[PDB]
Write a protein that binds this ligand. Structure first.
Ligand SMILES: CC(=O)N1CCc2cc([N+](=O)[O-])ccc21
Lengths: 141, 86, 103
């Protein structure tokens, strides 16, 4: 369904990581499967050789928290105009205050111990629902 | 125009209506002043800083900073954020 | 630039913003619109330093680097009861519990 188009038409890209997270680029191959790429340290870049119609999304490499690319969820490299590479501007989203707390708490408590925190049962299920590329790919479809 | 969000321990937080109304819960509790029997002031102050951070960085390519949460307030902020959807 | 402030007196905290070039007195006007008390009945402080009406918030040390949205700078507020000013009193916030063993 949500796949890269096999255009075989080169498109030059700059992944820019304007986030404080280690960014994991995720390419969606031609069968729809997420393919992880080498990670980007915060504020660093990588010129990447992609193709028109291809699908990229970006995640915190450690938590798989979802990032934005050019203020949106999916990045599709387009035609290079005047030979200038395309900029994939990876940024932090404005997470909800709820998601952000789940992030901080997920990062302090080993998941074995989520049930040892004194909070309502809705929050244990929310904590255990880790951000996840598979889940998100369904949401976007 | 401003509203007053009073914490469980008496501190009064005066934020703009636009900021508070971003919360569906607080809009309901306003429809002025709002008392939170369960949110202490070290959590409601963070909530209010989040309203400021949200309104400022919602729809911005000017790279947004991280919203910082001290580890010692994370579990309470979570409970309050879960109760307010914001 | 906008500077993001918590105006604090006693157990009152105003969250608002202002321009770096805005003046202390104009912030006193902003407080007046909210707390319904005239600028002459108020004193604004940076930490413990009493601020001068004619100075901009930037000259008073409030800048985009220090008065940020997610970490706003505090301006102390004191009121004059009748001919005489109270001392600057800012009640601290409640104390978080000890970090659980789980964290
Ligand atoms: C229903 C319920 O449990 N609530 C309501 C909001 C809230 C806040 C805190 N807090 O510590 O900020 C703790 C508990 C709760």
């Amino acid at each position: 369904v949500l796949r890269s188009v096999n255009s075989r038409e080169p498109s030059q890209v700059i992944f820019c990581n304007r986030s404080p997270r280690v960014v994991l680029p995720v390419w969606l191959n031609f069968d729809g499967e997420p393919q992880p790429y080498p990670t980007l340290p915060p504020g660093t870049g990588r010129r990447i050789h992609s193709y028109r119609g291809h699908l990229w999304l970006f995640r915190d490499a450690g938590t798989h928290d979802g990032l934005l690319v050019n203020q949106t969820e999916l990045f599709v490299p387009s035609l290079n105009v005047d030979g200038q590479p395309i900029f994939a501007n990876i940024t932090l989203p404005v997470y909800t205050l709820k998601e952000r707390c789940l992030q901080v708490v997920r990062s302090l408590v080993k998941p074995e111990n989520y049930r040892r925190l004194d909070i309502v049962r809705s929050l244990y299920e929310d904590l255990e629902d880790h951000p996840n590329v598979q889940k998100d790919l369904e949401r976007l479809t | 125009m401003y509203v007053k969000l009073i914490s469980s321990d008496g501190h009064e937080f005066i934020v703009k209506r636009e900021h508070a109304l971003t919360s569906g819960t607080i809009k309901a509790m306003l429809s002025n002043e709002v008392n939170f029997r369960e949110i202490p002031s070290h959590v409601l102050s963070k909530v209010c800083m989040y309203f400021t951070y949200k309104v400022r960085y919602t729809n911005s390519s000017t790279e947004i900073p991280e919203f910082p949460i001290a580890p010692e307030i994370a579990l309470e902020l979570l409970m309050a954020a879960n109760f307010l959807d914001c | 630039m906008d500077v993001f402030l918590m105006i604090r007196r006693h157990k009152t905290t105003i969250f608002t913003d202002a321009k770096e070039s805005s003046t202390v007195f104009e912030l006193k006007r902003i407080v007046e619109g909210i707390l319904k008390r005239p600028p002459d009945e108020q004193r604004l402080y940076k930490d413990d330093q009493l601020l001068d009406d004619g100075k901009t918030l930037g000259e008073c040390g409030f800048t985009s680097q220090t008065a940020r949205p997610q970490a706003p700078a505090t301006v102390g507020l004191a009121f004059r009861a009748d001919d005489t000013f109270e001392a600057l009193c800012i009640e601290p916030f409640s104390s978080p519990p000890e970090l659980p063993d789980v964290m």
